[PDB]
Symmetry: C2
Subunit: 158 residues, 2 copies
Amino acid sequence: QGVNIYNISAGTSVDLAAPVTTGDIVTFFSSALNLNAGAGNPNNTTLNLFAENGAYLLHIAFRLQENVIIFNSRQPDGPWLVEQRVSDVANQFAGIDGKAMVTVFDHGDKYQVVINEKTVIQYTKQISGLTSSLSYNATEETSIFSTVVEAVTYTGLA
Amino acid sequence: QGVNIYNISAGTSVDLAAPVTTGDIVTFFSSALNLNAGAGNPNNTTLNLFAENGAYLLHIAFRLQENVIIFNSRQPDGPWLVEQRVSDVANQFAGIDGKAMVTVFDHGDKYQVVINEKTVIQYTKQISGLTSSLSYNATEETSIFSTVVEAVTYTGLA
């Protein structure tokens, strides 16, 4: 039913005009894909889906030094739960250069992450609720994504 | 469930790797928005959703000379059915410049077109079926969209 667009600059967090609940979609667009980027410490780039209460419903990190994409969750004041790891970054982004896009479907119990056209994980949710906040911080000056990441949310799909 | 990406150059028509049936989504991205474009004859820009049989499930035209966005349908060898018109183009694209995006939801009986974040029409379907082809032709050298239009399809949503 609805389509929202957001310009998320590296380091920001935009509150959603409409929350991404079950059945909904959210895609992150990067007009750059720097996989040569220097040493990140630790997450060269993270993309998060928060709850109204700062709870990390999902944490998507990109670590080039560890050549791995990390997936996790955490209560607002709690500790990082059980990680997850998909190995070999560049190989997930193969297919498209110069740009990239990360799609996160919300299937109620699980978050399906898809990089470009390839599903990278069917991540089972640790924490729960509905996403009301997004974030895109480069935990070390060499984001594998462009200085700005567009974000489109397809909500009201139900 | 699935995410497909397509680079549709002005004048082309890409066959979908997966068809956009009911419940599915398809968004067109233009990295340019030329609303100053010259006289178009007649549709400065059209975006179509076809059936395997060349049937136009939906025709989205942009006419700057007529300052109107047209919506229609036609059998492969049939005539243009009952048109539809949303007036004042520039006003639909307000909100975002330099770029633009046209989203078409498929609600079985109706196609909801959304330009950027604004729903422009809840178009009731004349013809039926499922889309297997897309097209983006500039019916006169001054497309209001960039020379290339990315297209992302969110299918397998069911």
